[PDB]
């Protein structure tokens, strides 16, 4: 049966599943965001307070890779958590109609905000695959400096700034993702009643 | 938009058509009126666009009754119409109550006819402000001005048109409450000559009218021997 | 731009553009000239034909034995206002047994045309008139405008290419007063000629004249009654 | 936007939006006991300055008919006047007091007059009309559409769904006019955002003796969970 | 859209009627009315910008009947129309029924007139508020206000204008203590409210005060020589 | 509860958090901006009044790296301070409706200027990561002039112009960022009442 | 206080601070534009009437560098003063509404002109950084000519034509920037009243 | 004062200054365009009757450089006096209003046509900088034909085809520029009344 | 004077100058378009039924260069003929107005078809400058096949595919061009009366 299939869908992804994501976001995700941000600052200070030589091209500090992998994990978790809410809203967009679409606009607005949170922030300043970017951009200069070796002094500082600006990028992207998550929380918690039941029939003036 | 009808409000409670109708009065030539101790005197800055028009065309001073005068600034057809309404109001007043209409009452009756045009979608507001002036032994001298919105207030001196600011800044200098009409004529002509700008627009005519003791409650055009004797003083006081 | 599709709408600068656009319909009609001496008032028009093998459109109209008009603009508005004037004059002869003054007719015309400027569902009258008459105050020449405004005039020309006639009249005003009828009609015809190209000139077919005075009712001279008034015009070079 | 226009689904949208103005007014309760009918509503003021003894949400139409509403009071004062006139027309013709159903019909006709023309909006009120005719009580519910419903109990306004389930679970016949007032006040106590005083509500009852708006003393009596 | 013509919105609201409450604050003035045990008082400020105006014509207090007085707040031309209609209704009431109209009834007549403008798209609503005062036979002094939407109610005190919330806070703070209300206490309360919310140190020229009392039920507008008597007593204590 | 989450969101970032940012921008950030601008205009004239050789390719001048780092540390704090106002506004956008959206439009217009501050004036002429591209551009000349070397004079003169242009760009970008900050201050101060509480009032005739 | 932060901004950037810019533009900047066009035409007519050899690749002509530095300084100053006018207008945009937006329209209209002058016309044909671009385009050909270099006959002419096309570019850009400055002057002088108090309209 | 500045501007750039340009365009510029269109086709027909070899790589054809320099001078002279008409129209755009903009529309409509003439049909198919575009490519081919040399003959015919194609480019660009100038002439002559005094203050229905 | 310029410009480009173009297009241009597609199909069938080796990389075919040169000569004439119609219509655009623009719409509608033809469909699938686009690619392949001689077979097959895909391209472009010319013929012949005199003012309702 057709309604049986629609029921099997709407029972697997319910309002409770979408609210379990909002609780976790408001509780732990934001503190993890702020932790990655303070860690990025803690790392950026070290590079700002350091001199680099040819020896620093022979090894990459694991302090930066740890923060980049933490941001990687955070981005992945938030992407899946947001696609859950998207799946909850999108299996309830009702029959297409010229009118009676005052709740459909709500669904499209919240889906647009979630699409923003995904694409405009996670990369799916800097996004999910910043670690690949860092390692490629550095592996260029590490070969240009070793061979034989290049006597360019500005290259040696450009290595240092590759190390620093990525921590800065993390520190800013986390600050922006916090705002986006805090906006999605309000949007859901204010509009959740017409995301589930968008249409409400009044047949009182019929006989 | 919110500025296409007088039946419409804006989110801050403004009706922009009524204001745009005042913008039309701001773009018209200047008329003034001063309440003396024993009468009222009107003066108008009458512009002559072409030399083909006779001396006496586009009269902007109107007799609404045998004790009331009217000066207008804005659209002139609208002013002629409102004069025709101010005439039938005073006519019906005498027909029903048997005596000359007061000016506080005529002003209210015309103000309401003007205000009625600020409420509907089928009509625009009027595009003319105007002053009324009367004298009676009991009611004394009186001067009211009426705006497109339908507001009406009394005055000791007033101006309407382009050089409103410049003219009231000169009228406040006058100690009008001490003087007579023949002495305020000189001042009325002097102000009209001060505020007129020959470069902004071409030559002009001076148009004056009176009501007071010296006319016995009869609104009259000023004679020529006095209008010239005041236009001369206006020229001789421009040495400043 | 978008305060133009209705006459009940002001603009932020304090203007009504439909009235200004109705005034542009007077510039689409042929040119007319009006002028007065101390004894007589004259209207001369230049008639225009649609097809060459048809008759010329009539430009001057009889309203009463002491008033007449020449029209530039829409024909229908002119035909309505003329029928208004005629009945307003008959209504005056019926009651008072006197001819209606011209000032009191043009005041009524203005009062009539003021309504479409203010109430919606009616069009402004897109016709201008030059009104020549004679009453107990002498001769009169009145201009009437689609703006419901009217002027008392020494002389005036309206219609297409009328600035030339106006410029002519503006420098000969000092002569019209003591001019006899022939000279006055000739000044009118020359002011009218100043509106044409250098190719064309005045002709019996395309000139109508209207005269009213003390001892003269409003007469109209159209085709062959005009040739006395044309004889005398200097053959202008360019 | 327009009222003389159907949607392709076949709906009248401005009527649906006029009902949204009823769904946001103050609550109003209605219960039909065996020997009477109760009408109760929330009459709460925005300050201590408002004199509550000057305007009334419970109004009489006749000796034996009375009203409450949810929504707009300006709209209510028109229908009060119209109902009071229609009752007098009926009396003038037949010299009998109008039945409670004919008034509802003739008032829904007035509400329907304002649904068919352009240049007029419908009423932003629903009514509850209590009566006592032919030894039986009556209670109706007129809507802006021009439609009426006879009820045994119902609630209109804010939280009109939970206030109705409360009645479905806490209402039966074999009651009388005093056991029903307690239930109506209990149904209003759900949505009362504060202490319920004698002056924050307004009550009216109908019976064999006719319609009467109770006084603040009688309200304070039963506000103690008494009777 | 749902804001230009008087239609309903999806949330059941009329925005052109809410925008007529915003026109009340365009005049830039504030009115206050207070009720006592034997009196009822209205107060407003009298702001002439020019010395060329006659101050006698610049007023917002009006006499509807000998026993009823008004103060109008909002657009000035709308108020004269509403006042003339109030006078016509008060006169026809007595012509028809043989006794003077109360305030309770005149107020709701004006409100019934105003509601038709919200339910019919012919005419605009009036951007004006109205506060009335009068002495009743059994009920005593009365203070009544009506709105552009057709809402009306009686009050112990109220205000109308820009400083209306910060006036109704002052008033509700003073009303709870329930002192022995009197003529002098009433006028002092009104003037103190208008002084606090404006912070202006009033002159007798900058306000106009209309009063009505059980002794003299005739509405009378006060003189500058009688407002000074109440103003001086304020500076003392 | 849901309202508990809303209120704990809004208690942490209130109006005063944003007024602190605006009051600090009006006082210290502007002064820092003109200071950086004067430093850059002072650095331009030095390189202008200097003939370059190959000795300037074997050494990167500290006096430009300092100005670029100062501009970077300024832009970081400007971004992180603007996100505070963004988070204060975006967690009060009320539930979606087809009307009563005047303050909503105010909110969106005041976000339409903070994004303008963040994107097209901050890099997240030139922006935050000027310091990496300066070095990656100058290295491309330093590796050519040193190798053997290269014998083009235009390359030396381009090294000089590279050192000069990035101080010019800092001066211009500071001149632009001052305008944007001064324009954000006015937009906040003239609209903060509709930013926090956009939808106001519930009138007595609805009952 | 909040309102003090407003006036402490609006008093430092007044109508006088922008009218001074307009006056100096009308007086001296136009003549400077004319002079740079003159010098670019001079150098362009000089290099057309010549014939380059391999010796030319071992020195950059200073007649071109001076002209490009001069245009660079001009464009820098114009950008600064344009941002001054932008700040003056932008600190006075009033609160946000749905109506009474006839002066905000003028504000955004003149800001469009200032943006058009800043972005599309100063590079911030060619704008501010023409000199380094010239130097890159010339360094490529120099290194390709000098090395056992290149036996191409067209490469030498390409160098010769770079050196002239850039003067052509400076000439055209000057001719174009004069027009935009002259347009901004008219816009300001005709709209400065609504650029200060666009919303003086109140009740009466 | 201010009006003195406005009049000093509008007296230096008048309708005469632009009518002179229109007359010169209708007089001599079109004949020069046609002459270039003749010479380009002559050179194209010449190069089609050729047989290229290694000898044609060590010598640039002066016949082509002449035509390209001629087209360059033409484009420059047309641009610099199109800017004259632009300034004429642009120092008369009246003050901003929401009405009475029927001449402002004419002004903008003619400035769009001037934009088409200026920015794309003169390169500010091919435009002003066609000679460098020719010599860069031909040098790129010569450097491989000469060397060790390349023996691919498609390269040798690509030389021929470059030399022919650029003459065809000029032949077509002249044809298009003639039309674009003939359109501006009419657009000016039919509208210079409204391009100069767009608004006319003559309102007789006031007092 | 000015009317002298307008009429001296309009009598030079008349309706006959466009009807002659239409006649020639309907008569001979379409048969030439057919003959080029015929020869391109012949050469395509020739290239398919053959196997390539090193000897093909040492010289180009005389068969394909002819087809491409003929297509080039076609497109040149079609462009130069379209621009005549363009000029005829463009020197008759009347003075700008906010009304009475129903013939101006026809003008701007046929000029859009001419714009779709000349600037875009001639490339001023493939355009006139296709012979160089063929030669550059075939040279890129030849220099790799000849050299060290690349022993990659897919390269030698790509040679054969370059020699066929261009014949295919010409065959398609000729069909598309015939379609567009047949469209322009109808568009001119059904609208030439308002393309010349778009406004008529026999205004009989004025006296």
From Swiss-Prot, chain B:
GO terms for cellular component: cytoplasm; cytosol; extracellular exosome; nucleoplasm; nucleus; proteasome complex; proteasome core complex; proteasome core complex, alpha-subunit complex. Keywords: Acetylation, Cytoplasm, Host-virus interaction, Nucleus, Phosphoprotein, Proteasome. InterPro entries: Ntn_hydrolases_N, Proteasome_alpha, Proteasome_alpha-type, Proteasome_asu_N, Proteasome_sua/b. The keyword Acetylation applies. GO terms for biological process: proteasome-mediated ubiquitin-dependent protein catabolic process. It comes from the Eukaryota. This is Proteasome subunit alpha type-3. GO terms for molecular function: ubiquitin protein ligase binding. It comes from Homo sapiens (Human). Induction: Down-regulated by antioxidants BO-653 and probucol. Up-regulated by bacterial lipopolysaccharides (LPS) and TNF.
From Swiss-Prot, chain C:
It comes from the Eukaryota. Disulfide bonds: none annotated. The 26S proteasome consists of a 20S proteasome core and two 19S regulatory subunits. The 20S proteasome core is a barrel-shaped complex made of 28 subunits that are arranged in four stacked rings. The two outer rings are each formed by seven alpha subunits, and the two inner rings are formed by seven beta subunits. The proteolytic activity is exerted by three beta-subunits PSMB5, PSMB6 and PSMB7. Interacts with NOTCH3. Interacts with ZFAND1. One of its GO terms (biological process) is negative regulation of inflammatory response to antigenic stimulus. PROSITE patterns: PROTEASOME_ALPHA_1, PROTEASOME_ALPHA_2. Belongs to the peptidase T1A family. Signal peptide: none annotated. There is a cross-link at residues 112, 205 (Glycyl lysine isopeptide (Lys-Gly) (interchain with G-Cter in ubiquitin)). It comes from Homo sapiens. One of its GO terms (molecular function) is lipopolysaccharide binding. SMART domains: Proteasome_A_N. The modification Phosphoserine is found at residues 107, 174. CDD domains: proteasome_alpha_type_1. It is found in: Cytoplasm; Nucleus. Induction: Induced in breast cancer tissue (at protein level). Up-regulated in liver tumor tissues. PANTHER family: PROTEASOME SUBUNIT ALPHA/BETA. Keywords: Acetylation, Cytoplasm, Glycoprotein, Immunity, Isopeptide bond, Nucleus, Phosphoprotein, Proteasome, Ubl conjugation. This is Proteasome subunit alpha type-1. Glycans are attached at residue 107. GO terms for cellular component: centrosome; cytoplasm; cytosol; extracellular exosome; nucleoplasm; nucleus; proteasome complex; proteasome core complex.
From Swiss-Prot, chain D:
The modification N6-acetyllysine is found at residues 63, 164. Keywords: Acetylation, Cytoplasm, Nucleus, Phosphoprotein, Proteasome. The modification Phosphotyrosine is found at residues 17, 69, 114. Its main location: cytoplasm. The modification Phosphoserine is found at residues 7, 9. Phosphorylated on tyrosine residues; which may be important for nuclear import. InterPro entries: Ntn_hydrolases_N, Proteasome_alpha, Proteasome_alpha-type, Proteasome_asu_N, Proteasome_sua/b. One of its GO terms (biological process) is proteasome-mediated ubiquitin-dependent protein catabolic process. It is found in: Cytoplasm; Nucleus. The keyword Nucleus applies. GO terms for cellular component: cytoplasm; cytosol; extracellular exosome; extracellular region; ficolin-1-rich granule lumen; nucleoplasm; nucleus; P-body. Induction: Down-regulated by antioxidants BO-653 and probucol. Down-regulated in response to enterovirus 71 (EV71) infection (at protein level). The keyword Signal does not apply. It holds the Pfam family Proteasome_A_N. Belongs to the peptidase T1A family. Component of the 20S core proteasome complex involved in the proteolytic degradation of most intracellular proteins. This complex plays numerous essential roles within the cell by associating with different regulatory particles. Associated with two 19S regulatory particles, forms the 26S proteasome and thus participates in the ATP-dependent degradation of ubiquitinated proteins. This is Proteasome subunit alpha type-2. It comes from Homo sapiens. The gene is PSMA2.
Curated annotation (Swiss-Prot), chain E:
SUPFAM superfamilies: N-terminal nucleophile aminohydrolases (Ntn hydrolases). The keyword Glycoprotein applies. It is found in: Cytoplasm; Nucleus. InterPro entries: Ntn_hydrolases_N, Proteasome_alpha, Proteasome_alpha-type, Proteasome_asu_N, Proteasome_sua/b, Proteasome_subunit_alpha6. One of its GO terms (molecular function) is NF-kappaB binding. Keywords: Acetylation, Cytoplasm, Glycoprotein, Nucleus, Phosphoprotein, Proteasome. It holds the Pfam family Proteasome_A_N. The modification N6-acetyllysine is found at residues 94, 96. The modification Phosphoserine is found at residues 9, 55-56. The modification Phosphotyrosine is found at residue 151. One of its GO terms (cellular component) is cilium. GO terms for biological process: positive regulation of canonical NF-kappaB signal transduction; proteasome-mediated ubiquitin-dependent protein catabolic process; proteolysis involved in protein catabolic process; regulation of inflammatory response. PROSITE patterns: PROTEASOME_ALPHA_1, PROTEASOME_ALPHA_2. Component of the 20S core proteasome complex involved in the proteolytic degradation of most intracellular proteins. This complex plays numerous essential roles within the cell by associating with different regulatory particles. Associated with two 19S regulatory particles, forms the 26S proteasome and thus participates in the ATP-dependent degradation of ubiquitinated proteins. Belongs to the peptidase T1A family. This is Proteasome subunit alpha type-6. The gene is PSMA6.
């Amino acid at each position: 049966k057709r309604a049986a299939l629609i029921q099997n869908l709407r029972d697997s992804y319910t309002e409770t599943s979408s609210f379990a994501v909002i609780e976790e976001w408001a509780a732990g995700t934001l503190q993890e965001i702020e932790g990655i941000a303070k860690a990025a600052a803690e790392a950026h200070g070290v590079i700002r307070n350091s001199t680099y030589g040819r020896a620093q091209a022979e090894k990459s500090p694991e302090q930066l890779l740890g923060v980049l992998q933490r941001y990687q994990d955070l981005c992945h978790n938030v992407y899946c958590q947001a696609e859950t809410i998207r799946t909850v809203i999108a299996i309830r967009i009702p029959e297409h109609k010229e009118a009676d679409n005052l709740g459909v606009a709500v669904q499209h607005a919240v889906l647009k905000i979630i699409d923003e949170l995904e694409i405009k922030t996670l990369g799916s300043p800097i996004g999910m695959y910043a670690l690949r970017e860092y390692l490629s951009a550095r592996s260029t200069v590490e070969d240009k400096l070793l061979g034989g070796g290049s006597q360019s002094p500005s290259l040696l500082l450009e290595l240092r700034q590759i190390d620093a600006d990525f921590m800065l990028k993390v520190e800013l992207a986390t600050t922006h993702l916090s705002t986006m998550v805090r906006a999605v929380i309000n949007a859901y918690l204010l509009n959740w009643k017409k995301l589930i039941q968008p249409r409400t029939g009044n047949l009182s003036y019929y006989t | 938009g919110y500025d296409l009808s007088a039946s419409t409000f804006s989110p801050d409670g403004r009706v922009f058509q009524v204001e745009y109708a005042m913008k039309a009065v701001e773009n018209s030539s200047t008329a003034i009126g001063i309440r003396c101790k024993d009468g009222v005197v009107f003066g108008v800055e009458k512009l002559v666009l072409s030399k083909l028009y006779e001396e006496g065309s586009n009269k902007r001073l109107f007799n609404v009754d045998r004790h009331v005068g009217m000066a207008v600034a804005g659209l002139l057809a609208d002013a002629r119409s409102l004069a025709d309404i101010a005439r039938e109001e005073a006519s019906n007043f005498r027909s029903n109550f048997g005596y000359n209409i007061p000016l506080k009452h005529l002003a209210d009756r015309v103000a309401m006819y003007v205000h009625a045009y600020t409420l509907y979608s089928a009509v625009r507001p009027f595009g003319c402000s105007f002053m009324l002036g009367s004298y009676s032994v009991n009611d004394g001298a009186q001067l009211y001005m009426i705006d497109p919105s339908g507001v009406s207030y009394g005055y000791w001196g007033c101006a309407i048109g382009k050089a409103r600011q410049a003219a009231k800044t000169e009228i406040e200098k006058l100690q009008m409450k001490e003087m007579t009409c023949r002495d305020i004529v000189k001042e009325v002509a002097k102000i009209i000559y001060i505020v007129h700008d020959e470069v902004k627009d071409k030559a002009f005519e001076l148009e004056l009218s009176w009501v007071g003791e010296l006319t016995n409650g009869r609104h009259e055009i000023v004679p020529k021997d006095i209008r010239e004797e005041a236009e001369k003083y206006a020229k001789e006081s421009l040495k400043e | 731009n978008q305060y133009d599709n209705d006459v009940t709408v002001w603009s932020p600068q304090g203007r009504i553009h439909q009235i200004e656009y109705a005034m542009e319909a007077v510039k689409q009609g042929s040119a007319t000239v009006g002028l007065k001496s101390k004894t007589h008032a004259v209207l001369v028009a230049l008639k225009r034909a649609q097809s060459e093998l048809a008759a010329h459109q009539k430009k001057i109209l009889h309203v009463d034995n002491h008033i007449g008009i020449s029209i530039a603009g829409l024909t229908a508005d002119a035909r309505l206002l003329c029928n208004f004037m005629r009945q307003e004059c008959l209504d005056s002869r019926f009651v008072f047994d006197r001819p209606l003054p011209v000032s009191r007719l043009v005041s009524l015309i203005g009062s009539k045309t003021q309504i479409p400027t203010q109430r919606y569902g009616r069009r402004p009258y897109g016709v201008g008139l030059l009104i020549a008459g004679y009453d107990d105050m002498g001769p009169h020449i009145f201009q009437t405008c689609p703006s419901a405004n009217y002027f008392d005039c020494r002389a005036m020309s309206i219609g297409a290419r009328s600035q030339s006639a106006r410029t002519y009249l503006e420098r000969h005003m000092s002569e019209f007063m003591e001019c006899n009828l022939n000279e006055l009609v000739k000044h009118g015809l020359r002011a009218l000629r100043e509106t044409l190209p250098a190719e064309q000139d005045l002709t019996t077919k395309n000139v109508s004249i209207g005269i009213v005075g003390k001892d003269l009712e409003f007469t109209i001279y159209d085709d062959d009654d005009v040739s006395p008034f044309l004889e005398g015009l200097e053959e202008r070079p360019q | 936007f327009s009222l003389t226009t159907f949607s392709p689904s076949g709906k009248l949208v401005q009527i649906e939006y006029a009902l949204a103005a009823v769904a946001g007014g103050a609550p109003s309760v209605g219960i039909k006991a065996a020997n009477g009918v109760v009408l109760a509503t929330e009459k709460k003021q925005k300050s201590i300055l408002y004199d509550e003894r000057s305007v009334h949400k419970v109004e009489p139409i006749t000796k034996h008919i009375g009203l409450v509403y949810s929504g707009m009071g300006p709209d209510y004062r028109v229908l009060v006047h119209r109902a009071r006139k229609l009752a007098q027309q009926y009396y003038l013709v037949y010299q009998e007091p109008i039945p409670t159903a004919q008034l509802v019909q003739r008032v829904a006709s007035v509400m329907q007059e304002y649904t068919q023309s352009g240049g007029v909006r419908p009423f932003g009120v629903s009514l509850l009309i209590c009566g006592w005719n032919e030894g039986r009580p009556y209670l109706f519910q007129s809507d802006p559409s021009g439609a009426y419903f006879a009820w045994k109990a119902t609630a209109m306004g804010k939280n009109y769904v939970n206030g109705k389930t409360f009645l479905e679970k806490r209402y039966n016949e074999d009651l009388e006019l005093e056991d029903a007032i307690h239930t109506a006040i209990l149904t209003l106590k759900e949505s009362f955002e504060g202490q319920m005083t004698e002056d924050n509500i307004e009550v009216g009852i109908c019976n064999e003796a006719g319609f009467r708006r109770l006084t603040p003393t009688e309200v304070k009596d039963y506000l103690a969970a008494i009777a | 859209f749902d804001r230009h013509i008087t239609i309903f919105s999806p949330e059941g609201r009329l925005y052109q009627v809410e925008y007529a409450f915003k026109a009340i604050n365009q005049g830039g003035l504030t009115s206050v009315a207070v009720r006592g045990k034997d009196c009822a008082v209205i107060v407003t400020q009298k702001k002439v910008p020019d010395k060329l105006l006659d101050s006698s014509t610049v007023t917002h207090l009006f006499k509807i009947t000998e026993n009823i007085g008004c103060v109008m707040t909002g657009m000035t031309a709308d108020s004269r129309s509403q006042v003339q209609r109030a006078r016509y209704e008060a006169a026809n009431w007595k012509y028809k029924y043989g006794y003077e109209i109360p305030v309770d009834m005149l107020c709701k007549r004006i409100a019934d007139i105003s509601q038709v403008y919200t339910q019919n798209a012919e005419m605009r609503p009036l951007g004006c508020c109205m506060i009335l005062i009068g002495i009743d036979e059994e009920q005593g002094p009365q203070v009544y206000k009506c709105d552009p939407a057709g809402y009306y109610c009686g009050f112990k005190a109220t205000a109308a204008g820009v400083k209306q919330t910060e006036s109704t806070s002052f008033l509700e703070k003073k009303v709870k203590k329930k002192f022995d209300w009197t003529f002098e206490q009433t006028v002092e309360t009104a003037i103190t409210c208008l002084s606090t919310v404006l912070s202006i140190d009033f002159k007798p020229s900058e306000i106009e005060v209309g009063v009505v009392t059980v002794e003299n039920p005739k509405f009378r507008i006060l003189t500058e020589a009688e407002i000074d008597a109440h103003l001086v007593a304020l500076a003392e204590r």
